[PDB]
Design a protein around this nucleic acid. Structure first.
Ligand SMILES: Nc1nc2c(ncn2[C@@H]2O[C@H](COP(=O)(O)OP(=O)(O)O)[C@@H](O)[C@H]2O)c(=O)[nH]1
Ligand SMILES: [Mg+2]
Ligand SMILES: [Mg+2]
Ligand SMILES: [Mg+2]
Ligand SMILES: [Mg+2]
Ligand SMILES: [Mg+2]
Ligand SMILES: [Mg+2]
Ligand SMILES: [Mg+2]
Ligand SMILES: [Mg+2]
Length: 140
RNA sequence: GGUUUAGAACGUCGUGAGACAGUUCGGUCCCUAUCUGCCGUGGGCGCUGGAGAACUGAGGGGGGCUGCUCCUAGUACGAGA
């Protein structure tokens, strides 16, 4: 009945400053987990997370988009864990979306630009995740 | 085509012939280039015995325009846009 065991579930968010690479990382995650047959790119509007017309045209994520992927590993090490990822908007003008998601999620991948690193909205999502007391990993 | 000839009519002015930075219809645009100039093209002589070819380069002319798409690069800049 249960397609995957309880232990093999990973509810995570991808949170960061604007244009830190959240949607691109989500697209590569979907590609390497096989659900997406083309990598696409955000600035051409081919990103799957940026499904709304405004997101496609303006190159930004305005909504928290939740999807699910199956990951075994680089070397197929593990039985397929199911990662429930949510791509959140790093805009300070959409903070309720990230707070909304981050309440329910169990982990956060905080993305940081290698050049800019910690930025204002990275600090904002940091505070939100801290008040929700969630575990974090970081992706530079 | 307009502008200003000769015809005709409207409005207005005048008694009238006629007239109007008023309008309307119709109304003949000539020249075989001597010289200069210019574009090409040769004949004569010269360049120091004659001739055939290859050049040199003074000097002169020609040409010089620019959009859009992509990469750099969603890069620099920008809280973002
Ligand atoms: N050069 C480069 N561009 C990236 C990288 N990650 C994302 N981008 C581009 O940077 C822009 C913003 O990244 P995006 O994935 O949309 O991030 P988000 O807006 O923070 O969710 C897009 O044009 C991406 O294609 C990266 O690691 N290197
Ligand atoms: Mg994005
Ligand atoms: Mg952008
Ligand atoms: Mg006559
Ligand atoms: Mg008359
Ligand atoms: Mg010259
Ligand atoms: Mg010249
Ligand atoms: Mg581009
Ligand atoms: Mg704008």
């Amino acid at each position: 009945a249960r397609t995957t065991p309880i232990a093999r579930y990973r509810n995570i968010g991808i949170s960061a400053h604007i244009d830190a690479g959240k949607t691109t990382t989500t697209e590569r995650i979907l590609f390497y987990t096989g659900v997406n047959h083309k990598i696409g790119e955000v600035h051409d509007g081919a990103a799957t997370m940026d499904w709304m017309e405004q997101e496609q045209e303006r190159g930004i994520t305005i909504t928290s988009a939740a999807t699910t992927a199956f990951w075994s590993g680089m070397a197929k090490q593990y039985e397929p864990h199911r990662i429930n990822i949510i791509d959140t908007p790093g805009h300070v003008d959409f903070t309720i979306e990230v707070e909304r998601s981050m309440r329910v999620l169990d982990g956060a991948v905080m993305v940081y630009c290698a050049v800019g690193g910690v930025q204002p909205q990275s600090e904002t999502v940091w505070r939100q995740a801290n008040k929700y007391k969630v575990p974090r990993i970081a992706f530079v």
